[PDB]
Design a protein around this ligand. Structure first.
Ligand SMILES: [Cl-]
Ligand SMILES: [Cl-]
Ligand SMILES: [Cl-]
Ligand SMILES: [Cl-]
Ligand SMILES: [Mg+2]
Ligand SMILES: [Mg+2]
Ligand SMILES: [Mg+2]
Ligand SMILES: [Mg+2]
Ligand SMILES: [Zn+2]
Ligand SMILES: [Zn+2]
Ligand SMILES: [Zn+2]
Ligand SMILES: [Zn+2]
Lengths: 352, 352, 352, 352
């Protein structure tokens, strides 16, 4: 089996492994469309996950079931499905506590390209298919559906974590593809004014498209000072962090009103301490709740979002700026993620 | 002072009372636009709230502050403001418990046209100006603003009480002006498929406009059996009741899945017991939570929805089907509410 | 294998079935202690759950794992374990919605003595041992442990659903074994004044022992008015229904303040509609949230409640008012529950 | 009027000011018992809240209404009341958002000894008497009652923020007088195992009394490793921070399992950044919510805790280790808090 993988930190390239075999509850899927995530980049050229040798990359795919186990009941070979980035083992302690994201350990929900070969192969292995796969309606285009596995649940679980109230003002720090979905999520939660913080013209134009009402470029002065003016010094009702480094946490706390929420879905890789300003955090009493969690995965999550797209509630189409064909391009698309052109948001390779 | 009021049960007609005086914290407002509510009808021709003599009617109004109290600080004469239906007394017990709608009593938050003279007068009295009035931006049309005081908050509170989840399937029972806002509400909470239950063609055409994805007319079979078909027998994740009589509660509990929520914002007046089917209510264990409450009021509440319209989040314009002029029409508009023409949703009289 | 079962409605008696075989993920447990539930009585002598033939009864058991499936990993033969009444199939949809009680259907989480042979046999079958069993520390006495599987979770789930707040005033309608644990539940959620509604002298004495501060005997006038008296017409903050018929739902709504919550864990069998007084329910607007759900089950639920006992948080012992020995007795103890002696609360049969 | 106050940072001593005059809705109270707060110490010898000149200190008092406003209706001279540390202005925006602690600004609800003269005087001023005062039952001793205004609400609010679940394991970092009330609050939220982290013997003896089941003395190794052991490496379900500096935040995040809650009610005064270890915070994805808010104040809050004491649900008595008589000792008591003797927890001076 041919598959684009991580060779060792700082080194990738196509390799060959043995086609996976489904367990009684698993399914083997053949990619139809995939996408590279900035996370893979950090995983390969920054060892964000530790050292890994010959691990196929990728965790965002839409495929066709080619083989199922003896115990799979809802998916048969030939079925078109959307595959979640998070594919947990549903029979664990934490699944009973309500946090499947952490089934069997912190961030254990995430398997693809972490402790299991990713989706960038001629085939890949999905565990517990009846629990972790969702059928793909034929009316939803491959390009768009692939934004569902990770971009859309991360952005949306940003908006979810914020406890956004009807007509509340929400600030989104980081307008990348995840931020763009976090902006759409704030709009899906009844957000009134949505202040998107970003500087890429391609990202800002998309943000306005998804509901952004005010754009804030940091190259105009401090973010906390700009948001404060925009809100007559009232601050925002919530702040969703979708990107940036450690610092961005301080910004968040400073622009959020007392009793406000700061929801984080960004993956910090630098330093070892995320800054929480004690003065603006009411010396630990301003009731500014800070949240931060991995995006939900699993069938239901996928089906939920799939309806959101099916009923024109949101269209992830705008996130895809590049489209390529054939496996060979999985590599071209990948690198494209390492050096973000000013016209790039999210590339996708149809696998025809 | 001139004002259209309720004389005796079944009897209305213009009367004259003394122009009200502000307290140190209250304000006097001169209406700029108002709307009759079916409530008033029930209040007069059905004494839904008891016997009342010479009570100026109306509780939905957008006006101008003509006179403030000595202690009012955020409102002066000349200011255009939206006056919420619910204008509670913020210094009570229930306010500390978080239920201003019941400040000082059950539904005591509601004063206008209940224990206070309505807004259908040359002038009306608004208690606690700084806590119960909200500035109306010039860009928002009066026809529209007037829908915020009661229709939008009630409709929206329906969605709010429902505990909708991203992608969740919501069913709204009753597509009246309130139900229509409940349909926009659910869509504002990120509902996916929204099933609107109603028959009036003028109502359904709006329902589609506000997010309904499927129309269910009881004239085609039992509602419960239809929703069950549309949802492959899965049922809905939540059902908002915005109209109907006692029965409808049974429908609700029957269409919602175990674990779902039945949110009610409808005003039931007959019978003395609301039906909750034990069988499909899991014999008291299918976790189908039932909620029901008076719409929130107050400045903040209004502010929030004012922003929703301000940010083209939702447009209440479509609720206004008829626009009249001058006080005199407050009566034609009132009657018009009694006998709902097949082309009427919500009548509004401008400038008086 | 010998086992006391339900032959047909109104008829019970011992029968013999073949000893169950564990699936790769199940376990075979040998009871060490068990207890009859009023639900068995109704299930048999009132077909509360339909016609059943040769169905071993009982669902509250403590025992020893005698055989495990090839895939079980946390349980081995010889282990002492507490077995939850609810033993769901954790790989279902509703488990992703957060309601394992309804995994695969409304109330589907409950298998023992419903769709699966009960625990009143020389052996019984527990599905998904790692997800549905919990180790029993030797320091906890069997008489006590057996109260955890159903009585404890149900009563505690009463308090839980009640949304009790520190110092809140709770009322427990029905002080049977479940009400008793609902009384300890409220105390566990930091309830201040706890009003227990009941007449049996043996129950009231236990109620006082678990935290009730006032006793209300319906034999002294209408409950609704008596509680109104005790609370200067303020009413209670929440009302936990732990027994009664359908009429109790009304009493509940009537004693709860606007914004309060009615939490019901009682299994209603009569009639086909649970009354909800529209008047005192604010005509559908006093915000009186009504909740009612089956008790949670599974390993975790059992581990949590086990620690409560282990750390002397609560002592179920007082619930056990009779102790028998040997299977023979499983029948005498069964009958004992049909005709509640004025000195009975909960009988338990030791060792098998 | 005689009163012990803050002359300027680092300097204190009695001073004289004019007896305060009640506004239409206020009340003047004469102290019957009061107590020093570690915070006054910081506020004075560490300017934790800025420079201040001649500000009467203290915020924890039980007194006698000596004069009420013309508008006050629930309080008359002679009445014995408990006066909450937090005494907000109930007619603000933040109050409609449900955070009276921040009425008029961040932490703005805390007036006493912050922006208003404290309770350490012959008389003191209480704004909004009907909203911010609560009657003290004669059965509750003064020593005990003075522990309600700040210690109890803060400790309890810690447990409240933690989102503790029945049987959940909770850790309390810091067992000071507030931490002792968080240990009590945890037990009041249904906690099973409660791990108290502290070294002062008089504090641990009290900790055990309030429900602590395990004592962790940092002088035996790293707290995180000790808790990890005690918990088989599982970690705690919640961590309430009631003392320590910045670092303690790191400890919390390191001992709480994924999906756990770090609830802070500690007042941090050093540095400008509270540490949040990215590694063990799941790099911003371990779903380890961090909370932290000012203790609730107001009449209702006080009435709730008063009931808790009235129904022997908790007894603050053991927090009081010293008692003194007359004003003169308010200073002896104050200094007693600056240099914590090994036998001190909370000093109270009776008869003002
Ligand atoms: Cl704003
Ligand atoms: Cl559907
Ligand atoms: Cl009371
Ligand atoms: Cl443990
Ligand atoms: Mg579909
Ligand atoms: Mg505006
Ligand atoms: Mg243990
Ligand atoms: Mg009392
Ligand atoms: Zn990416
Ligand atoms: Zn109307
Ligand atoms: Zn029973
Ligand atoms: Zn203190």
């Amino acid at each position: 089996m041919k598959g684009f993988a991580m060779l060792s930190i700082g080194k990738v390239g196509w390799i060959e492994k043995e086609k996976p075999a489904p367990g009684p509850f698993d399914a083997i899927v053949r990619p139809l469309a995939v996408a590279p995530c900035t996370s893979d980049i950090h995983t390969v050229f920054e060892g964000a996950i530790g050292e890994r040798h010959n691990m196929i990359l990728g965790h965002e795919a839409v495929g066709e079931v080619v083989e199922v186990g003896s115990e799979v009941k809802d998916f048969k070979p030939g079925d078109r499905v959307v595959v979640p980035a998070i594919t947990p083992d549903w029979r664990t302690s934490e699944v009973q506590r309500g946090y499947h994201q952490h089934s069997g350990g912190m961030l254990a929900g995430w398997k693809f390209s972490n402790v299991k070969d990713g989706v960038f192969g001629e085939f890949f292995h999905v565990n517990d298919a009846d629990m972790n796969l969702a059928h793909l309606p034929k009316e939803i285009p491959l390009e768009a559906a692939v934004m569902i596995p990770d971009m859309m649940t991360t952005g949306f679980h940003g908006a979810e974590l914020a406890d956004i109230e009807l007509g509340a003002t929400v600030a989104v720090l980081g307008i990348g593809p995840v931020g763009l979905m976090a902006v759409a999520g704030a709009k899906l939660r009844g957000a009134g004014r949505i202040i998107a913080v970003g500087s890429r013209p391609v990202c800002v134009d998309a943000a306005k498209y998804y509901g952004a009402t005010d754009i804030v470029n940091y190259k105009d002065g401090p973010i906390e000072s700009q948001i404060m003016n925009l809100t007559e010094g009232k601050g925002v009702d919530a702040a969703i962090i979708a990107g940036g480094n450690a610092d961005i946490m301080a910004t968040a706390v400073k622009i959020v009103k007392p009793g406000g929420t700061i929801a984080n879905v960004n993956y910090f890789g630098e330093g070892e301490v995320l800054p929480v300003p004690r003065l603006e955090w009411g010396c630990g009493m301003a009731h500014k709740t800070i949240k931060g969690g991995l995006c939900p995965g699993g069938r239901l999550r996928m089906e939920r979002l799939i309806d959101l797209v099916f009923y024109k509630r949101v269209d992830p189409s705008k996130l895809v700026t590049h489209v390529f064909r054939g496996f060979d391009n999985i590599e071209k698309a990948f690198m494209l993620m390492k050096d973000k052109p000013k016209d790039l948001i999210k590339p996708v390779v149809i696998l025809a």
